[PDB]
Amino acid sequence: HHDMAGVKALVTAGGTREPLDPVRFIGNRSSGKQGYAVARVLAQRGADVTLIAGNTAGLIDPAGVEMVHIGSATQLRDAVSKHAPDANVLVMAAAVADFRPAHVAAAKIKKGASSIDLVRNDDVLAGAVRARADGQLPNMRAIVGFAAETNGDVLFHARAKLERKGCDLLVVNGWLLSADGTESALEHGSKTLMATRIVDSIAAFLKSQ
Amino acid sequence: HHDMAGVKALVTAGGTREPLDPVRFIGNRSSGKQGYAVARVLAQRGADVTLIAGNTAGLIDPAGVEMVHIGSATQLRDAVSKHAPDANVLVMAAAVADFRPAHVAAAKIKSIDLVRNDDVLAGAVRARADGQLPNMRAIVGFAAETGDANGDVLFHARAKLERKGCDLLVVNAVDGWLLSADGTESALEHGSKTLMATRIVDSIAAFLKSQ
Numbered sequence: 001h002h003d004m005a006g007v008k009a010l011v012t013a014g015g016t017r018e019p020l021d022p023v024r025f026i027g028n029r030s031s032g033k034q035g036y037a038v039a040r041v042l043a044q045r046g047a048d049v050t051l052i053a054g055n056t057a058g059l060i061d062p063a064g065v066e067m068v069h070i071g072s073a074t075q076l077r078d079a080v081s082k083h084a085p086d087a088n089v090l091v092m093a094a095a096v097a098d099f100r101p102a103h104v105a106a107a108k109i110k111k112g113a114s115s116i117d118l119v120r121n122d123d124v125l126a127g128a129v130r131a132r133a134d135g136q137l138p139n140m141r142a143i144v145g146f147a148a149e150t151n152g153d154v155l156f157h158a159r160a161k162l163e164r165k166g167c168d169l170l171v172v173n174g175w176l177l178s179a180d181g182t183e184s185a186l187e188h189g190s191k192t193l194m195a196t197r198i199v200d201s202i203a204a205f206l207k208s209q
Numbered sequence: 210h211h212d213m214a215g216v217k218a219l220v221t222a223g224g225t226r227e228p229l230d231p232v233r234f235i236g237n238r239s240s241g242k243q244g245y246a247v248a249r250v251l252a253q254r255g256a257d258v259t260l261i262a263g264n265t266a267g268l269i270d271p272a273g274v275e276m277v278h279i280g281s282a283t284q285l286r287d288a289v290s291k292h293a294p295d296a297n298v299l300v301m302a303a304a305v306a307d308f309r310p311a312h313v314a315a316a317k318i319k320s321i322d323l324v325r326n327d328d329v330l331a332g333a334v335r336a337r338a339d340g341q342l343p344n345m346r347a348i349v350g351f352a353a354e355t356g357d358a359n360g361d362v363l364f365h366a367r368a369k370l371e372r373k374g375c376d377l378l379v380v381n382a383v384d385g386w387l388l389s390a391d392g393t394e395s396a397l398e399h400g401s402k403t404l405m406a407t408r409i410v411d412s413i414a415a416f417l418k419s420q
């Protein structure tokens with residue numbers, strides 16, 4: 001059936017790329033594929049889905065989904081900021097670069113005979129939790145974060161991050177943590193099995209509110 | 210038709226990735242497409258082709274080609290050192306990072322000092338001139354030049370040909386240029402990857418019958 005009908009969902013997926021110059025950048029190895037499966041499952045279940053995609057050019061756009069393409073952690077931030085006020089659910093599956101080149105060159109860098117000075121990018125997810133706390137996001141019912149974790153075990157850092165981020169749900173790479181104390185293990189199955197579990201926890205959270 | 214039959218060709222393509230830690234790296238936006246097409250056109254004309262591939266645009270291994278996948282500029286260097294004694298033709302199409310982080314972290318990191326990576330094309334030219342690659346008949350380099358306030362595309366293409374010392378330098382104007390070590394400069398007319406890959410290999414085969 002269709003448990004996400006009427007639900008407007010904003011999802012980010014993939015890594016961002018922080019440009020050093022026109023051609024080079026700082027990036028990561030994340031694939032974006034678990035984020036895409038969640039966007040896809042959500043649309044399969046009736047949600048009106050907008051997907052902000054980073055470094056995911058080899059992936060198939062999920063059917064029924066509004067595509068928004070970004071490169072950078074700041075571009076991801078502004079795309080979320082543009083699309084956040086109208087959505088009911090936000091899923092932050094993207095590996096958002098926490099740092100950026102301090103200055104980006106306008107032409108291909110060719111050095112002498114060196115270093116990269118860095119500056120910090122905004123925590124988009126924490127900006128979203130905050131904006132809802134300040135009354136800026138009245139349509140928002142569920143903020144979902146992502147974490148790959150492994151001085152404590154996988155669960156020391158996962159609760160510690162759930163608390164620190166102040167969001168409704170944290171999906172850990174597996175575990176699924178709610179801001180109301182519940183935790184469900186994620187048996188290591190396919191990405192479609194995972195995505196379904198994630199969307200069931202979402203609808204369950206939406207219904208609990 | 211099958212002019213390249215019997216020619217052992219070593220090809221690099223893609224962009225290297227310089228790790229900062231197990232998940233993050235420095236990279237570039239090179240697709241690998243023109244270098245794969247060269248390696249394909251080379252194979253379809255009879256050459257026995259080895260392709261050392263960095264990061265590409267999801268490109269599939271060309272059929273008939275021996276594949277070596279690498280990550281970093283240093284790994285690219287090691288794989289070229291390994292395979293170059295067999296080759297008769299080296300085609301350096303990869304974008305090889307000229308810098309890497311001085312320290313790679315053993316776990317997700319929670320300024321980046323850079324140190325320089327070796328010039329692999331230049332180490333090839335020096336090695337053949339020192340007599341360590343008797344089988345190597347042709348060393349091809351690639352370049353993507355834009356032209357600026359100091360010189361047009363060709364001004365920069367000429368300086369790079371002379372600095373590097375290779376037999377042929379394929380220049381994409383960011384048309385384009387094919388510059389030979391005898392001073393011949395042929396324009397690269399616009400085309401698809403396959404058409405231009407045929408022009409590049411044409412150029413290699415003319416250089417080889419000329420030697």
Ligand SMILES: Nc1ccn([C@@H]2O[C@H](COP(=O)(O)OP(=O)(O)OP(=O)(O)O)[C@@H](O)[C@H]2O)c(=O)n1
Pocket residue numbers: 073092093094095096097098121122123124125126144145146147148161317318319
């Ligand atoms: N600038 C950032 C960084 C992260 N995220 C979000 O925060 C969550 C992951 O946070 P985090 O665990 O801090 O990512 P890491 O940088 O890998 O974590 P850590 O600092 O603990 O290593 C994800 O939903 C991601 O989309 C974000 O919105 N903005």
Ligand SMILES: Nc1ccn([C@@H]2O[C@H](COP(=O)(O)OP(=O)(O)OP(=O)(O)O)[C@@H](O)[C@H]2O)c(=O)n1
Pocket residue numbers: 108109110111282301302303304305306307326327328329330331349350351352353369
């Ligand atoms: N460390 C390097 C850098 C470049 N290359 C090869 O050298 C050729 C020229 O690449 P390019 O980056 O233009 O050479 P640089 O002189 O390093 O470039 P720039 O002028 O931008 O500094 C290419 O075929 C490339 O595969 C290489 O073998 N090893």
Ligand SMILES: O=C(O)C(=O)c1cn(-c2ccc(O)c(O)c2)c2ccc(-c3ccccc3)cc12
Pocket residue numbers: 013014015030031032033034035036093094095096146147148171172173174194232
């Ligand atoms: O969607 C993907 O496959 C992707 O690329 C991911 C990127 N991150 C991510 C986010 C924030 C970070 O700070 C960071 O280092 C990495 C993920 C975190 C978790 C998961 C995941 C969750 C549950 C089950 C399986 C996998 C998937 C990804």
Ligand SMILES: O=C(O)C(=O)c1cn(-c2ccc(O)c(O)c2)c2ccc(-c3ccccc3)cc12
Pocket residue numbers: 020024025109110111112114115116117224225226227235236237304305306307308323
């Ligand atoms: O210097 C060169 O000629 C030079 O190739 C580079 C200089 N940088 C660079 C940038 C910003 C800095 O702050 C700085 O110190 C140095 C680079 C960064 C990345 C790469 C690269 C990485 C992967 C594939 C291909 C190329 C190459 C260079």
Ligand SMILES: O=C(O)C(=O)c1cn(-c2ccc(O)c(O)c2)c2ccc(-c3ccccc3)cc12
Pocket residue numbers: 023222223224238239240241242243244245302303304305351352353379380381385397405
């Ligand atoms: O194979 C590809 O298409 C690829 O990805 C390339 C990577 N470089 C490259 C190498 C060294 C650099 O420093 C750098 O910035 C980039 C290329 C240079 C030229 C060409 C090319 C040549 C002739 C016609 C069309 C394209 C293609 C590539």
Ligand SMILES: O=C(O)C(=O)c1cn(-c2ccc(O)c(O)c2)c2ccc(-c3ccccc3)cc12
Pocket residue numbers: 015016017018026027028095096097098099118229233234318319320321322
């Ligand atoms: O600190 C963190 O938690 C943290 O996320 C990072 C710290 N660095 C970093 C590395 C080398 C350095 O020399 C240094 O000063 C700081 C990063 C570099 C890249 C990324 C990144 C880029 C794209 C997507 C996802 C992540 C994330 C971090």
Ligand SMILES: [Ca+2]
Pocket residue numbers: 109110307
């Ligand atoms: Ca360089």
Ligand SMILES: [Ca+2]
Pocket residue numbers: 098318319
């Ligand atoms: Ca971090």
